[PDB]
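S2.1 Query sequence (Glycoside hydrolase family 61 protein)
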Amino acid sequence: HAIFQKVSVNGADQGSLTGLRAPNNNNPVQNVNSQDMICGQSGSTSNTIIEVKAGDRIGAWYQHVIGGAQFPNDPDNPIAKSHKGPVMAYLAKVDNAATASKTGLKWFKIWEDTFNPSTKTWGVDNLINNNGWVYFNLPQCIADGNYLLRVEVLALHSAYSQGQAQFYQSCAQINVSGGGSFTPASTVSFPGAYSASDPGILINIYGATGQPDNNGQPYTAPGPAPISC
Ligand SMILES: [Cu+2]
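Output structure tokens follow.
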């Protein structure tokens, strides 16, 4: 239970909900066929389009509720420790990031922090240790212009049952300058890219003594591999 609700650009805080299409509650999306998978449940929208340069260091901030912790010493801020899983980021090129319909876009993955089997560390573990932030660079080669930037937490604490993996998604509206001429060889659809039977979605992450360590096995994130310039 958490909401992606703020972006930073090379460390500069763009402000709460600035440029975001974000849900207004922290409940998960669980039906991978839902249009809610694209940018989360329909919630707040913003007219701002965040100016970024290709290659920039982007931060995406999750907190338990809109605005931060739900109450003093909230143990589930930025997200409950139990919610082990990967974090993924995708781009979709759009003409106008403020007015584009979220439906039917052509998505490609640019980054993910999944599971390190030898350290037993999930992307959500790093999110927690970075106080809700996940950091990644925009590719240096992507073309100039508007994009939606979709960031997604996949929490697997209940994912051993069909349709009970939990998704926490929002989209940021950005304009890229200083880019290159990259065109993705392949794109995917949301909804569509994920199937409930995917081995990173229908998964029992619990080991011998009940710890969520994936039995020290490698984990396969759903969707396509991140592009590289
Ligand atoms: Cu939760």
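The two ends are 34 Å apart (CA to CA). The domain at 3-216 is CATH 2.70.50.70 (Coagulation Factor XIII; Chain A, domain 1).
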